[PDB]
Amino acid sequence: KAPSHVPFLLIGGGTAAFAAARSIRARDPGARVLIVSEDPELPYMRPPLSKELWFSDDPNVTKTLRFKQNGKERSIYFQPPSFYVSAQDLPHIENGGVAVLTGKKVVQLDVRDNMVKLNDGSQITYEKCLIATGGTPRSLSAIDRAGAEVKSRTTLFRKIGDFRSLEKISREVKSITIIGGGFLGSELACALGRKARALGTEVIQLFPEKGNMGKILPEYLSNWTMEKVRREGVKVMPNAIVQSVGVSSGKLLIKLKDGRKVETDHIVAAVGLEPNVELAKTGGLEIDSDFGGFRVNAELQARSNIWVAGDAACFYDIKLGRRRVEHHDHAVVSGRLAGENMTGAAKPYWHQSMFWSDLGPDVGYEAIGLVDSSLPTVGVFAGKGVIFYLRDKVVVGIVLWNIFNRMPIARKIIKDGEQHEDLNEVAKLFNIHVLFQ
Ligand SMILES: Cc1cc2nc3c(=O)[nH]c(=O)nc-3n(C[C@H](O)[C@H](O)[C@H](O)COP(=O)(O)OP(=O)(O)OC[C@H]3O[C@@H](n4cnc5c(N)ncnc54)[C@H](O)[C@@H]3O)c2cc1C
Ligand SMILES: Nc1ccnc2cc(Cl)ccc12
Incomplete structure (x- = not known):
């Protein structure tokens, strides 16, 4: 062959x-x-595996692997x-x-x-x-020590097969726990939360940070995001560090370092790559x-x-x-x-790539550049805003919170390398007319 x-x-x-x-x-x-x-x-593209494929009206979506994007239907595969x-x-x-x-x-x-x-x-x-x-996908040391039973009931989410197996689990068990507060974990919590509201089941998300996306977004916006995930039908447990995982009355038992205990039927680990x-x-x-x-x-x-x-x-x-x-x-x-x-261009990485996250059709994030909650940030808001990530008085990263069709603006701000004394005037470029961290 x-x-x-x-x-x-x-x-x-x-x-x-x-x-x-x-x-x-x-x-x-x-x-x-x-x-x-x-x-x-x-x-095939992966973003739909934690988003659009779970919000589809077609119940054959698990077989067709087609999803509706605005609104046009398409396949997860790049080409037939x-x-x-x-x-x-x-x-x-x-x-x-x-x-x-x-x-x-x-x-x-x-x-x-x-x-x-x-x-x-x-x-x-x-x-x-x-x-x-x-x-x-990474795994947790607590799960590696937990034994075959716990490992067989723990999902590392990345591929088509992981979506199909977890979608079936969501229709069979009463409680699913997501370990991980990043974008993947938070998207899956909103997706399983939607599915669980119709079936009357439970969805739990726990992570060590103080709020969802705590390593990416400033604290004030991370906390706003946590409340939105909670209102999607998710029980969010911040400040949770997993100490051990075992099997009790046929259910999985998660022991946290702070003494709390969570009983659940299936675990999804979204703890990096x-x-x-x-x-x-x-x-x-x-x-x-x-x-x-x-x-x-x-x-x-x-x-x-x-x-x-x-x-x-x-x-x-x-x-x-x-x-x-x-x-x-x-x-x-x-x-x-x-x-x-590979065909002789000899071109350097220059056009900056963007990323996005949707926590349902309601909350949407776009970002570009060096986005890290450790960097100093300046947020100008108006449910809508822009977060500037600074380094030496130069904007090096931008997060657009519920602001769309303005990525070319953010890309130019970072390319120009300009310094700004009034980032409120830069916020006007995103149709925003206060918080520091
Ligand atoms: C569920 C999910 C949702 C996501 N959502 C978003 C999103 O909303 N926004 C966003 O910006 N990003 C998102 N991402 C991240 C984005 O999908 C990844 O950045 C992207 O898939 C990376 O592309 P890649 O080609 O580098 O790697 P991959 O897509 O992982 O492709 C690598 C392929 O190579 C195979 N391979 C590895 N080693 C070998 C080998 N030795 N021989 C042969 N084959 C091999 C691997 O099995 C895999 O099939 C998401 C990722 C996942 C998993
Ligand atoms: N919405 C996202 C933005 C960026 N990176 C992501 C990585 C994963 Cl694994 C899942 C979702 C992502």
Whole structure:
């Protein structure tokens, strides 16, 4: 099936890989691109798995994997199978194409010989290679010590299969507990909260921070967000640190360090991500000790014929410094950029990528740049506002709270690197006419 040589080899079949394949095909007409994906599915977008797919009117959504966005229905897959060609035919099809080798994992990378070895022993030589391996969900040490019973009833949410299995659980058990206050955990709490209001079931979200998104948003806005999640039918337990997890009367028992105890039927752990850097060993590729991931330069390049994009890429931002970003749009932007550089562009990361979060069709966040609650922040509000994240009197990150269609404005503010004595005048650029942290 897999040919012996391919011009463009993309390792990983996710968002960054697909954006690169499209970019390569657009920049190099007739290009022959092979995606190798350990997952059995073709490249698909993940944001819907914690959002639109749960708010669908169609009860066959679990099968169709179609969702309504404003309002137009679409598939979770980036392209239908008709868009792709088979790997075996990729060398011979006139004017080339894009092929996906599913159910196959690259286990060895030989940088000197421009070659990889798959889990089945097959070997593929390449001319240009992209590493777009993404990451694997983290787990809690308390769950790793809890035993097989607890582990079998704990979900690490990332893939289509995780959505299908958790959606079935939401219709079978009476209580689900989400561990993690980040965007994924909070989105899933709002999604399961909607499903639980109709079924009369329970949804719990606990995390160590004082409020939802506490590591991202300032405290005043994190607390406002916590109240909104609570009003979606969720029992939110802030300031909760898990000490142990066990099984009691057939139910899961979560013991917190502060003495509280939570009984539940199923657990969903949304506690971050680890970059998939296993190939750095055989490949002799540098890993970044500070941010994790493959260390690459501003052009996303690691070695002469190897680039890295997406969640796994720790890159140099010429304006904001060395970073590693784990956002959907960043995978598209960095994958597209890598693709262009794999066809001779030599372009640095320049167009900043944005990210967003929806806590239902009511609350919506957009953000861009260096967004960290540790940085000093200035928030101008009017249920609506903009949060400026500062560094040396220069806005380095922006959060748009219920403000839409103004990302190009935020992108220009950060690019300009200007200093501002009255950020209230900058807030007017977002149609905002007070809080510090
Ligand atoms: C449920 C969910 C909701 C999200 N919602 C949002 C959102 O609303 N907004 C936002 O900005 N971001 C969101 N994100 C983040 C965004 O989806 C990720 O940043 C994006 O998917 C990263 O793209 P990627 O190509 O780098 O990695 P991935 O999408 O993880 O793709 C990597 C693929 O490569 C495979 N792979 C790994 N190693 C190998 C190997 N050795 N050989 C072969 N294949 C391999 C992995 O199995 C995976 O299939 C969400 C993520 C999840 C999971
Ligand atoms: N709404 C989001 C914004 C950014 N990053 C996210 C990562 C995950 Cl895993 C889930 C949701 C996200």
